[PDB]
Design an enzyme around this catalytic site. Sequence first.
Site, PDB file in Angstrom:
ATOM      1  CG  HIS A  81      -1.985  -1.129   0.999  1.00 21.57           C
ATOM      2  ND1 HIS A  81      -3.152  -0.916   0.305  1.00 21.57           N
ATOM      3  CD2 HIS A  81      -2.009  -2.390   1.431  1.00 21.57           C
ATOM      4  CE1 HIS A  81      -3.878  -2.025   0.379  1.00 21.57           C
ATOM      5  NE2 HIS A  81      -3.195  -2.930   1.056  1.00 21.57           N
ATOM      6  CG  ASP A  85      -2.980   5.135  -2.165  1.00 17.32           C
ATOM      7  OD1 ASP A  85      -2.112   4.340  -2.622  1.00 17.32           O
ATOM      8  OD2 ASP A  85      -3.826   4.844  -1.275  1.00 17.32           O
TER       9      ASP A  85
HETATM   10  C1  LIG Z   1     -12.308   2.777   1.132  1.00 17.62           C
HETATM   11  C2  LIG Z   1     -10.933   2.215   1.553  1.00 17.62           C
HETATM   12  C3  LIG Z   1     -11.001   1.511   2.905  1.00 17.62           C
HETATM   13  C4  LIG Z   1     -10.236   1.300   0.521  1.00 17.62           C
HETATM   14  C5  LIG Z   1      -8.720   1.421   0.498  1.00 17.62           C
HETATM   15  C6  LIG Z   1      -8.098   2.520  -0.091  1.00 17.62           C
HETATM   16  C7  LIG Z   1      -6.714   2.663  -0.091  1.00 17.62           C
HETATM   17  C8  LIG Z   1      -5.899   1.703   0.493  1.00 17.62           C
HETATM   18  C9  LIG Z   1      -4.373   1.832   0.520  1.00 17.62           C
HETATM   19  C10 LIG Z   1      -3.841   3.032   1.291  1.00 17.62           C
HETATM   20  C11 LIG Z   1      -3.639   1.803  -0.840  1.00 17.62           C
HETATM   21  O1  LIG Z   1      -2.434   2.087  -0.924  1.00 17.62           O
HETATM   22  S1  LIG Z   1      -4.602   1.257  -2.233  1.00 17.62           S
HETATM   23  C12 LIG Z   1      -3.200   0.775  -3.316  1.00 17.62           C
HETATM   24  C13 LIG Z   1      -2.824  -0.707  -3.336  1.00 17.62           C
HETATM   25  N1  LIG Z   1      -1.852  -1.051  -4.391  1.00 17.62           N
HETATM   26  C14 LIG Z   1      -2.173  -1.031  -5.691  1.00 17.62           C
HETATM   27  O2  LIG Z   1      -3.320  -0.721  -6.082  1.00 17.62           O
HETATM   28  C15 LIG Z   1      -1.066  -1.382  -6.654  1.00 17.62           C
HETATM   29  C16 LIG Z   1      -1.410  -2.495  -7.644  1.00 17.62           C
HETATM   30  N2  LIG Z   1      -2.412  -3.427  -7.141  1.00 17.62           N
HETATM   31  C17 LIG Z   1      -2.111  -4.486  -6.385  1.00 17.62           C
HETATM   32  O3  LIG Z   1      -0.964  -4.748  -5.990  1.00 17.62           O
HETATM   33  C18 LIG Z   1      -3.279  -5.402  -6.006  1.00 17.62           C
HETATM   34  O4  LIG Z   1      -4.526  -4.973  -6.574  1.00 17.62           O
HETATM   35  C19 LIG Z   1      -3.416  -5.524  -4.450  1.00 17.62           C
HETATM   36  C20 LIG Z   1      -4.396  -4.436  -3.972  1.00 17.62           C
HETATM   37  C21 LIG Z   1      -2.076  -5.390  -3.708  1.00 17.62           C
HETATM   38  C22 LIG Z   1      -3.809  -6.951  -4.034  1.00 17.62           C
HETATM   39  O5  LIG Z   1      -5.045  -7.354  -4.635  1.00 17.62           O
HETATM   40  P1  LIG Z   1      -5.388  -8.882  -4.969  1.00 17.62           P
HETATM   41  O6  LIG Z   1      -4.207  -9.790  -5.099  1.00 17.62           O
HETATM   42  O7  LIG Z   1      -6.573  -9.049  -4.096  1.00 17.62           O
HETATM   43  O8  LIG Z   1      -5.871  -8.619  -6.471  1.00 17.62           O
HETATM   44  P2  LIG Z   1      -4.992  -8.559  -7.813  1.00 17.62           P
HETATM   45  O9  LIG Z   1      -4.904  -7.179  -8.368  1.00 17.62           O
HETATM   46  O10 LIG Z   1      -3.648  -9.208  -7.790  1.00 17.62           O
HETATM   47  O11 LIG Z   1      -5.975  -9.400  -8.765  1.00 17.62           O
HETATM   48  C23 LIG Z   1      -7.405  -9.119  -8.796  1.00 17.62           C
HETATM   49  C24 LIG Z   1      -8.155 -10.397  -9.127  1.00 17.62           C
HETATM   50  O12 LIG Z   1      -9.536 -10.073  -9.401  1.00 17.62           O
HETATM   51  C25 LIG Z   1      -9.926 -10.597 -10.670  1.00 17.62           C
HETATM   52  N3  LIG Z   1     -10.978  -9.726 -11.191  1.00 17.62           N
HETATM   53  C26 LIG Z   1     -10.963  -8.358 -11.307  1.00 17.62           C
HETATM   54  N4  LIG Z   1     -12.098  -7.856 -11.729  1.00 17.62           N
HETATM   55  C27 LIG Z   1     -12.919  -8.961 -11.879  1.00 17.62           C
HETATM   56  C28 LIG Z   1     -14.257  -9.091 -12.291  1.00 17.62           C
HETATM   57  N5  LIG Z   1     -15.034  -8.064 -12.615  1.00 17.62           N
HETATM   58  N6  LIG Z   1     -14.791 -10.339 -12.301  1.00 17.62           N
HETATM   59  C29 LIG Z   1     -14.015 -11.371 -11.949  1.00 17.62           C
HETATM   60  N7  LIG Z   1     -12.744 -11.369 -11.561  1.00 17.62           N
HETATM   61  C30 LIG Z   1     -12.246 -10.120 -11.541  1.00 17.62           C
HETATM   62  C31 LIG Z   1      -8.625 -10.689 -11.450  1.00 17.62           C
HETATM   63  O13 LIG Z   1      -8.812 -11.553 -12.544  1.00 17.62           O
HETATM   64  C32 LIG Z   1      -7.691 -11.208 -10.350  1.00 17.62           C
HETATM   65  O14 LIG Z   1      -7.813 -12.627 -10.133  1.00 17.62           O
HETATM   66  P3  LIG Z   1      -6.554 -13.668 -10.009  1.00 17.62           P
HETATM   67  O15 LIG Z   1      -6.765 -14.774 -11.045  1.00 17.62           O
HETATM   68  O16 LIG Z   1      -5.216 -13.089 -10.458  1.00 17.62           O
HETATM   69  O17 LIG Z   1      -6.579 -14.173  -8.580  1.00 17.62           O
HETATM   70  C33 LIG Z   1      -6.525   0.606   1.084  1.00 17.62           C
HETATM   71  C34 LIG Z   1      -7.904   0.468   1.095  1.00 17.62           C
END
Ligand SMILES: CC(C)Cc1ccc([C@H](C)C(=O)SCCNC(=O)CCNC(=O)[C@H](O)C(C)(C)COP(=O)(O)OP(=O)(O)OC[C@H]2O[C@@H]([n+]3c[nH]c4c(N)ncnc43)[C@H](O)[C@@H]2OP(=O)(O)O)cc1
Lengths: 357, 354
Positions: free
Chosen positions: A124, A154
């Site tokens: 994050h 972010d």
């Molecule tokens: C309102 C608040 C509380 C929410 C909130 C806000 C902000 C934060 C903090 C502060 C942040 O920093 S947010 C930033 C996080 N980092 C990133 O976004 C950088 C890149 N992303 C990532 O590394 C990942 O998304 C991560 C968030 C770390 C981990 O997520 P993950 O492994 O659960 O998911 P992933 O991205 O690897 O894969 C997603 C998964 O979902 C699937 N998917 C997507 N869309 C759909 C759909 N519509 N129908 C079916 N399947 C779907 C993909 O195919 C994939 O499946 P997979 O086969 O690979 O297991 C936290 C929470």
Amino acid sequence: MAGPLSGLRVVELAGIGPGPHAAMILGDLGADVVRIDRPSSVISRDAMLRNRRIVTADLKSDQGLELALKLIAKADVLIEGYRPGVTERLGLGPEECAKVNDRLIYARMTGWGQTGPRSQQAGHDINYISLNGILHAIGRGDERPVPPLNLVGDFGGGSMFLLVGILAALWERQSSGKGQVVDAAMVDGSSVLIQMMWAMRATGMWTDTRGANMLDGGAPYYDTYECADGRYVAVGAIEPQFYAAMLAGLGLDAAELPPQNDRARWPELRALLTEAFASHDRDHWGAVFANSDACVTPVLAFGEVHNEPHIIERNTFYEANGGWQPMPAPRFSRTASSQPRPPAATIDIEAVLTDWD
Amino acid sequence: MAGPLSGLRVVELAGIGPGPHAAMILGDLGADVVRIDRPSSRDAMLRNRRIVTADLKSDQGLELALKLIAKADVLIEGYRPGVTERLGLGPEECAKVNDRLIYARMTGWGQTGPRSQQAGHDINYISLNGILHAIGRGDERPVPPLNLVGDFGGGSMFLLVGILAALWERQSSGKGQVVDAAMVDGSSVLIQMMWAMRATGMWTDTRGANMLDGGAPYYDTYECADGRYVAVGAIEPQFYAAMLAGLGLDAAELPPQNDRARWPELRALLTEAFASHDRDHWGAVFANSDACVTPVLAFGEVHNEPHIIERNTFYEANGGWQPMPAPRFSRTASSQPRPPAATIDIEAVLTDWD
Ligand SMILES: CC(C)Cc1ccc([C@H](C)C(=O)SCCNC(=O)CCNC(=O)[C@H](O)C(C)(C)COP(=O)(O)OP(=O)(O)OC[C@H]2O[C@@H]([n+]3c[nH]c4c(N)ncnc43)[C@H](O)[C@@H]2OP(=O)(O)O)cc1
Ligand SMILES: CC(C)Cc1ccc([C@H](C)C(=O)SCCNC(=O)CCNC(=O)[C@H](O)C(C)(C)COP(=O)(O)OP(=O)(O)OC[C@H]2O[C@@H]([n+]3c[nH]c4c(N)ncnc43)[C@H](O)[C@@H]2OP(=O)(O)O)cc1
């Protein structure tokens, strides 16, 4: 639809944090924003999903994929923020999108980037800013670093660079007629966000010691101060003329204080300023210094911001469901933005392909 | 000139903080950037520019400036309101010699309103809109997040979104316009997530008591055995569980991850665990992991970090390292920044443009 980005069509693969914040701003400025969420969830709670049409669609299924692939075909921009490989292995990669729409701006929001050793690690905000020096620089010197919420990785160094990439690529597509891939990594954007410190570091004007620099709280003239009521003011009186104005309002004679920029005597100076601000309450100081160049302002809590004159008069905020929310930024003279619309109850993806003729 | 903004022409009136940062990023991405300063460089923020001098108060200095702006696409100014009007460089004078110009006004407080003429810096703009109050430990006065949030994230970056959105709008309308970027507004949008969260009861105004402000034991830094630090960002229960296992901590013995009444107790257990080995040890243990545990590097260590080196996030120059352009582009890639281009005469630039 109102705003400078009228006409612009955007597809957003639902994620968390930067990805949606970027999409919000595009919406905010009048882009047509369609968000595809997973069915295995769902009118939405998150005001971050304003200026949005939400659609269900299981992208694992063969149907889901092609529906999605239709939307992208008739759209200007795609936003996704999943780890590298996810969209590829869905059949929504860059190479696959470039075959149904070579005009697409393909916008990829990650923390670590598309390649390299950390590219598959979860993370994050706090993790991305820990690696590039930023986190180490935030907080008091006698204590461990404090995270600046998720503002720096972010949003400031993430979503905002995604937006600049999208919009710079749209400018490019006006010349060449073709889209391209935008690779926005939070670790890179946040590094450019702090370019000032990298510049000052080179010229001996910034050290790695936390809490001992001009802008990190080490300077008694750029910091917060506790007042008599336990509330706080901020002081940012860097320029000598503004500092002088502050001293006069505090009742302190320059002749009785050490020089503003004699660092060896910052302890004495801080002690003097601390005792002065401690002698009246925040709202005293707020009045004494309004309309003043002393660079002294009240440190308001979220819950008080709605009562601050300058905030009210410029309409920085609007009301929406037992909560204030920020109005779009920046502002435009001719093609102004509208009040944002609350999150738009789910829609069917056929209805959207239809509406998009 | 390399980048997606090749042949965008930008005039920048010299100031401090946001306006120069925005101009830098424009340059970084291949734009032609001319910065007018006053007869009275070291700052690498002045990279990817041509610098020219001009007394804008003289008759000639002004004439020359208006001849630039006539040729350019974007003008950037970061002075107090009224300042460019009085110089003869205001929106309306500029629209006489170029109705296409994007006119970009970078302030803290905005163009009008009671504080519009008040001097200020970053720390002041973020004090007024709730942001500064929210940052730091709870037992203590708020701490400025350098000037990352008002000047840059809520400042320069919103100026940029505005300059480039207005360039898009122009392509359909043939017309420029004025972009009013105020740090107190931009920074408010930048923290929209907290405003959303507060509306739904998932953020309080108490400092140090939230998921993302350092009050959560799974989202904070921890001191290690050597006095250095790690950051923990294990929000998702699966990441959190991965971290516990690598710490040697049996989940059954600990309070729930998200029972806030017991966070202090949880924090004390995690503090003991992290304190028992050095930072580099944890960096090893959690490499390739989803535990969301990373070393907190100081600036002078960043050049030694594999992920940084191999993605070329920085480049060497002058004293030391500087960030390469962001974000990155597949087809029209940015180049390594050129150092600042010592004073040229403003007449040169004019023949060079038509
Ligand atoms: C309102 C608040 C509380 C929410 C909130 C806000 C902000 C934060 C903090 C502060 C942040 O920093 S947010 C930033 C996080 N980092 C990133 O976004 C950088 C890149 N992303 C990532 O590394 C990942 O998304 C991560 C968030 C770390 C981990 O997520 P993950 O492994 O659960 O998911 P992933 O991205 O690897 O894969 C997603 C998964 O979902 C699937 N998917 C997507 N869309 C759909 C759909 N519509 N129908 C079916 N399947 C779907 C993909 O195919 C994939 O499946 P997979 O086969 O690979 O297991 C936290 C929470
Ligand atoms: C590397 C370090 C040391 C630098 C540094 C970086 C960042 C920071 C912090 C963290 C920041 O927040 S920077 C952001 C500060 N705030 C803003 O920029 C908001 C908008 N601007 C302002 O409020 C003001 O410009 C302010 C910064 C407060 C300083 O006010 P000021 O009175 O000195 O200046 P001003 O804008 O009122 O008017 C400027 C003045 O300059 C003149 N000028 C300009 N260009 C020229 C020229 N080419 N030839 C002749 N004259 C020229 C204008 O005519 C004007 O003069 P005037 O006659 O009206 O008095 C501090 C320092």
